[PDB]
């Protein structure tokens, strides 16, 4: 029972590793002509849509650092397990960024698709955008998993896939698509470049927390015990 | 039981707010090259597809003003509850349009994607187009929710997502994509500009009403009591 | 019971009318720049994907003339009911083509997206292409509806949507996308132009028949009575 | 019972034949302008998504040679049945490549979309890319079919469709999209051209095997008997 | 002295032959993506700019049938010599169209760039456009050659090159670029297709005549003898 | 001698009429894909380059209202003759705009290419841009005509053509290309729309005057009599 | 006097070296989106236009191997001097191709823009195209230099620039632009690849010879002594 | 005579100011779609082509810092006059960069078109490219002005215009177009950013010096006195 908890860490490590490799790989600058924004955005989404199928089955499939905290603040996971996914995700993000670098040609690779802030957009406007991107994403994942609802949501994994597709397509223009610290983290480190890299952690975390609370405190509450459930933290 | 009815108003307010923010945000003029019509259209659809998952679960997820009336004329909702969603939607539409404005750069924003009538297209042709766009959309949402059918419709929420994708892609060319008063409403007000803005209310409302009746009076009727069901209006 | 059979004819009439209006409308020549082939193809698919949800529930949702015959040759429908859908579809196709014409500007409309044979492609090569396009489409729809399989096919209606997306995207290049007589029929008549218009009827019909037999005589047979089932023709 | 096993070989032959015809047909060089990478990639995916619906129902629907071995190494199939699918797939791949050739015009066809290695990319980098492309694809198909999980995966067939869409979109740039020996095989033979054609067999096979083991030995094991199950090989 | 007159006929035959081969060759349908209108237009211009250098030196370099008449009505050439250039030009146009056909692939060639009238544009609007296109072209060539002006016009041959570039770029949209009967003539005959082909002869001839008179009767007259000069017709 | 002065007015009327017809005609909205800015810009230039050849020979060839004043302030023309060209130009501009309207289809024509101010650009920034555009244009035309310099300027008319090409290409982005009141004037009147239309008169006039003085008072002065030359105003 | 002849060899060596470096450098594969054919074609032309100014002044400026022979067959140069330019050109072509290789990134460079024969085009059709491309080019250069004509040809060097622009733009599609053995030679050798490389030598040489004779034996002969002039060969 | 020397400094100041304003202004990031490389490159060329007409007449028109030194090393100018142009050019470059900044919107402006080194290209490869770009440019300007040659070079100013067009088009890809310190200087200072900014000074200066010597010591020497001419330095 103890070791089984560890496999989930692998699912999260491999899932994120693949997530960063395919999507960040999709960004690679070789589009000067068509607006690859349709492509890159579409790539992150299909990457996430599929990972959810292989990974989520085993355990979670969060992949996104900001999204994991959403579940923790969501009150339904151990504080340690939360920390386990974040480190598995960051390392997973870099493991992927590391390989993508080795495989793509010099002229092809630039900063490995480093989240570049849009000329006109200011730092404050960039944060709010990140706030809303994750809020919708988290709100989508939260409902999708919500057992309470049997209904006919259909491909719950595919549902999440498109939800992310929306965030990136839009996010791509304002803040070079973010809504995920892992995504922003790998390019900066694997290419010694840290600038506004914090707005990316700040918006998604606030967004995730905000988006998480919105589903609970309001939208679709847990008709049981709020104070009692918060015991998961103690194990 | 009384207050619970109010949360649904929030679901509709937040859903529409997000709906207008992401899709209208997608339109922003920065495509002069590729035909963003594929993008913008695709954006409104994924935005709607996802909102249906988070919002619909709690209550409705109509988002579209013309679509809400379809349900009311559809005979299965209180007249007051209908009015509650429309105001929640319009305000939600503006709340989103308001934020999108603050975040996008000056050169980027124009009229915040104001539904501009296509050069050649006349006002009459623009209305019929709006009539058909909503009719198909309403007809799709109506069937999707129709409990009667168990079958294997699959991701009912995703189904609605693509249905709207079709309306906008086509709508984008003739009347700068409409089929939703809320979508048309936010840009006009948040950018003091009212022109043909009525064709947008006129076509979608007629379309919604027409599309709603088509599913009932004909297609797939309610094998119970038509006169008896109309009692929901009285509560 | 007698009149109820007639409503199905309406579902097929409205479904096709909408099918031709949205997809053929999507083709309209105003893309000289991006390769609208991605768009037009994508449009026919979403149009079909959605119609299946509203229409199929009530009855069939074939929409495609060649596809209806597939079911008839498929041995599971009355010969008269088959004829009823074809005429409902052709008229539905024209009803849509008629309205699309009235609404689109002169410069916009050309031949209303008349299936133009590709310069190099010969008449024989154009037929085989049509043969394969419908075969896959019919084979997809046949399995989708096959009750025998409970499984987890998921959104059966959405499944059909993409299947058609494939046919049109490919079909668009060789024979200006066909695989549907109704689609080919409306532009030719609503714009007095008949040329190779037969290859379109010939390939899809052969394809549909061929594709239909493949699923039965081989692939997934009906483990019951082949000779007995053929009694549906007599009613 | 003996002959029934043979029909599965047909499902695999027809499925692959169609798979190569539609996707490879989509690649045909006539895009010099838009970045058909979005198209071609999208085509292979919808082609696979749909085949899974018609073919998988009858038996398997692997289509991909490297993917079939994944199931064999996956320990749950007869060694002979595995060999039966590979030959049915290769022949099916060529049967399709053969027809595509006859139908497309001379100027249109080049090498029938022969997997051309990207200028800068070296042979070693091309292999690793192929390794990761198939690993994710196999891992996706493996989970999708995994009975153990009832859940709400939704359209299991559509899920696989997008998963492949990701591999090709990315694969298209580095190694002209591979992740499938059959896809790489048809163009080389139907156009006497063999170069680096081995990297394609090498990466997908390693990837498939690697991806297969990852799901078992780790991720989601078979809580029964590993040594006992390996008896399927003996029949 | 008699035979020398004949060489001029060759200069005109070869000049036009090359003119139609390069420009019409430039039109060939293989641009679906970028707007080759910039290309095709640019091609006709450089083709004309250069021919003027090799051909004009020997004799004339009119190339354009409508332009030759401009000089004849311009009062400064024998009526027979005028007829000699027209037949040399038409044959030259076809000689070029004939070879272009033999060399370009089947899929490439369509109607050999047959002047296709623009969907919306009516026959009357198409004529006026042709009227203005040639008027400016003729007016440009007339001044360029006008000995009277020594000045510093510079590359008189290059001047004419761009003047034509303007006509075609604009002409390309309304009437698939015309302003030259020879250009319109070759595709129609070398591809049995005659439709509105007369508007092309009608507009350029009227335009040429009109443009010719404008330079004389008004703009820059011949300060000598108008009635006396008209004796060139008699030899 | 008196009537001869009048022909110059015709040269200016026809020149401008053609100038507005070809260039404004080039702008017509049908580019959504490629960046017609290269085209439209290129069109105005070739249009001007050629007019200079036919028109300038007879008299002036200013075409641009702001440019005519440059010559008047340039001290070398009668005040009345200056007024004669401006009215001939404005009427000429409209005469052209009038015909362009009648010939282009409804869907094609919008505002007849009305100088639309760029979203972000403010009114003040739009004026300075106009100031610099005309200054360079005037400075170029001034030198070109400057008899004093024999040298080898080459095609003086072609030189002016490209100079204008630069102004429009750049001008097109900030203020929808202006640098010419006539160009800005025709669309506004022929399509009842006056907005910021003054910035266009203000910048080019200031620019022209400023650019004119720069060549005289500084750059290349008139080594004769400044006070004496100013007598041309008195005739 | 003896050594001075040698400097001309340098002018030809440097001219060609630069010619191949800039134009072939322009081809480099990084355009997948816009149709760089406009670019690449335009590049070879400006490269040639300018070289003619620096190089031609000193001696010749042929640059093109096939073009040099045109002058030799043109009867006006020593047989040895002809051989001197060809070797200076080939070496110059490689010297340039060598440096371009060292400077461009791996992923960027492919075959260094190796003249790739167009899919559909056959070897015979590829030769005729090359025949006509050089004929017009040679005919243009021949007239340009022809002292006999004083006239107002204008920028003789610029005239040649555009003439070549035409050949390459057209040539680019059929035979990946050739009309110059040097251009075809450098990529093949600097990238061990020889295929159809002969059609390139065959067409341009035939074309050059043919084009050369056309200007003499016919067009604009040398009204002096044909047999006497052929003495230049003897010195 | 003393003050007259100063006006030349103004011609150089205004010329460069305009040069940087128009060309750098052309670069502004708003092309993501078409390959503005054709545009930006074309802009710098027309900007230079025209300035040469207004400025060169008065004095020089060098505009390019590296080009001025070419003339100084070219032995035909005072050492002080050389220094006067460089400072007039740098200040002129900034004066232009300063205004361009104030006028373009925030979102539009980025780094004001700061010469960004191409991902793959290394610092050494970037220098050689700069070396060759200026060498050809200087060699072109040198010949153009060379009095010795009367001939028919034509529009000497236009000749220089295209020569630069070539350098920038090519230069744009490798080192974001340089070949001019002034061009590279303005963006770095007006946007506190200095990186590899030296390679730009290093390559153009070496190139200019090298290109200058090539025309003298070899190509077309000065058949007079080399040691005597070097006296200009002393005045």
UniProtKB/Swiss-Prot annotation, chains A, B, C, D, E, F, G, H:
The water channel activity is inhibited by calcium through calmodulin/CALM. The record marks 230-231 as: Cleavage. GO terms for molecular function: calmodulin binding; cell adhesion mediator activity; structural constituent of eye lens; water channel activity. A motif (NPA 1) lies at residues 64-66. CDD domains: MIP. Aquaporins form homotetrameric transmembrane channels, with each monomer independently mediating water transport across the plasma membrane along its osmotic gradient. Specifically expressed in lens fiber cells, this aquaporin is crucial for maintaining lens water homeostasis and transparency. Beyond water permeability, it also acts as a cell-to-cell adhesion molecule, forming thin junctions between lens fiber cells that are essential for maintaining the ordered structure and transparency of the lens. This is Lens fiber major intrinsic protein. It comes from Ovis aries (Sheep). The lineage of its organism: Eukaryota, Metazoa, Chordata, Craniata, Vertebrata.
């Amino acid at each position: 029972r103890s070791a089984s908890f560890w496999r989930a860490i692998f699912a999260e490590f491999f899932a994120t590793l693949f997530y960063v490799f395919f999507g960040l790989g999709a960004s690679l600058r070789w589009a000067p002509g068509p607006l690859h924004v349709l492509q890159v955005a579409l790539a992150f989404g299909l990457a996430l849509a599929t990972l959810v199928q292989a990974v989520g089955h085993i355990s979670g499939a969060h992949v996104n650092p900001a999204v994991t905290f959403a579940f923790l603040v969501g009150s339904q996971m151990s504080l340690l397990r939360a920390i386990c996914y974040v480190v598995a995700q960051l390392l997973g993000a870099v493991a992927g960024a590391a390989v993508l670098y080795s495989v793509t040609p010099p002229a092809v690779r630039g900063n490995l698709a480093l989240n570049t802030l849009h000329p006109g957009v200011s730092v404050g406007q960039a944060t709010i955008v990140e706030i809303f991107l994750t809020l919708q994403f988290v709100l989508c994942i939260f409902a999708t998993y919500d057992e309470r609802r049997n209904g006919r949501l259909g491909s719950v994994a595919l549902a999440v896939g498109f939800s992310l597709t929306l965030g990136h397509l839009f996010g791509m223009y304002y803040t070079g698509a973010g809504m995920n610290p892992a995504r922003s983290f790998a390019p900066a480190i694997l290419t010694r470049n840290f600038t506004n890299h914090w707005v990316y952690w700040v918006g998604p975390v606030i967004g995730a927390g905000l988006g998480s609370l919105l589903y609970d405190f309001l939208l679709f509450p847990r008709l049981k015990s709020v104070s009692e459930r918060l015991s998961i933290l103690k194990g």
